[PDB]
Amino acid sequence: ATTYNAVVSKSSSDGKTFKTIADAIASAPAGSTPFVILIKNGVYNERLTITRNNLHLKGESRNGAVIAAATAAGTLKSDGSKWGTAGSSTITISAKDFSAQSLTIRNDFDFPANQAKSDSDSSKIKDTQAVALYVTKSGDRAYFKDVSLVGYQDTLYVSGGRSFFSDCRISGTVDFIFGDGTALFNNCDLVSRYRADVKSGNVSGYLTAPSTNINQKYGLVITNSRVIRESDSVPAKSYGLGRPWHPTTTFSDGRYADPNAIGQTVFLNTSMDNHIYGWDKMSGKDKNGNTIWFNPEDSRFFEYKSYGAGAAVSKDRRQLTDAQAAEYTQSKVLGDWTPTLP
Ligand SMILES: [Cl-]
């Protein structure tokens, strides 16, 4: 008995349906009773910030139901300032118990066309992060089933609490899954994209850039998934599994890369194609303004039974024991939260 409180569609003939997702959401009664919105197939050019708890979106299909907007961190607002990384997000989850199913969320920033522009072209953006989905610190218990997240740089920004991605497709280039949140991905396609602007022997990107605080037990946890390249032109050994992101943070002794943001990315029972070369390091600025490198061997980067040509042949890729692997069940990672659809 699945009941939709509202229906969004492109038809002005579909009946008492909404034209945009924002309107359908705004029709929700104040409070925290569950509210479910069916989004009929179509491309909805909208940027949404979810502040209503217990809101649930269901698209007619992951392939046909799309929420898309083109915004880069470097994209300028009316006042001439930049949107920023968080601000470029097509969808921002700032409420609890959100769920999206069978739909696609895209940031349509044309990263390749931007990279192809001449350097003297004043419209060529440097701050090229363009987030498709951002789960903020106010978005605990965000659930995404049969959802597709599309972007290049910084596709998925997960911060704060717990989020679960099941049977999803996430595509990107650089740090396309990043943040400090507890994000569990099960049975997902993590799609590494082609970079026309990167020479074949250089790094095209990194699947993850966790910023997990050292005291947080779980960061980015990918299980029973597939790490694949979007095309045969993605070179062998062009993608890192992860890179340690230590966010510039304000401390009583200055603003610089957080030394305690010792990120975690763990893969279990996940296939990896040949584009993966292993983990990588990342640089930031320390308390003195010097360049500092945060190394993978100093981060919580682990694998358990990866397979495929991209899996570990060498030993500089730490492996979990069977006992340690048992600590990465959905129950343990998500704790008191059991993700369920309306
Ligand atoms: Cl930063």
In terms of Cβ atoms closer than 10 Å to its own Cβ (0-12, 13-18, 19+), residue 158 is buried
Q: How far is the CA of 284 from the centre of ligand 1 (A)?
A: 7
CB atoms within 10 A of CB 17: 18
Task: In whole angstroms, give the CA distance from residue 69 to residue 72.
Answer: 10
Q: How far is the CA of 27 from the centre of ligand 1 (A)?
A: 37
What torsion do the CA atoms of 222, 228, 234, 238 make, to the nearest 10 degrees? 30
Provide DSSP, 129-180.
Answer: ---SEEE-TT--SEEEEEEEEE-STT-EEE-SSEEEEES-EEEESEEEEEES
The residues annotated with a catalytic role in the active site are 154, 175
Task: In whole angstroms, give the CA distance from residue 106 to residue 45.
Answer: 10
Task: In whole angstroms, give the CA distance from residue 172 to residue 112.
Answer: 12
The answer to whether 243 is annotated as binding is yes
Beta pairing class for 282-285 and 291-294: antiparallel
The answer to whether 245 is annotated as binding is yes
Q: How far is the CA of 200 from the centre of ligand 1 (A)?
A: 27
The answer to whether 115 is annotated as binding is no
Domain covering 1-342, topology: Pectate Lyase C-like (2.160.20)
Please, what is the end-to-end C-alpha distance for the chain in angstroms? Answer: 10
Q: How far is the CA of 288 from the centre of ligand 1 (A)?
A: 16
The answer to whether 223 is annotated as binding is no
Is 142:135 a contact under the CB 8 Å cutoff? yes
How far from the centroid of its chain's Cα atoms is residue 93's Cα?
12
Resolution (A): 2.4
Task: In whole angstroms, give the CA distance from residue 192 to residue 150.
Answer: 11
Q: What sign has the CA pseudo-torsion 313, 315, 317, 319?
A: positive
Query: Residues whose CB is under 5 A from ligand 1 (ion)?
Result: 248
User: Determined by which method?
Assistant: X-ray
Is 215:195 a contact under the CB 8 Å cutoff? no
The DSSP 8-state label assigned to residue 18 in this structure reads B
Task: In whole angstroms, give the CA distance from residue 221 to residue 233.
Answer: 27
The DSSP 8-state label assigned to residue 123 in this structure reads T
Contacts of 54 by beta carbon, 8 Å cutoff, 6+ apart: 32, 33, 34, 35, 95, 96, 97, 98
Q: How far is the CA of 22 from the centre of ligand 1 (A)?
A: 31
Domain extents for the chain? 1-342
Task: In whole angstroms, give the CA distance from residue 44 to residue 61.
Answer: 13
Contacts of 112 by beta carbon, 8 Å cutoff, 6+ apart: 152, 195, 196, 197
Structure tokens at 72: 């880069």
In three-state secondary structure terms, 101 is: strand
Structure tokens at 304: 């358990």
The answer to whether 202 is annotated as binding is yes
Is 177:197 a contact under the CB 8 Å cutoff? no
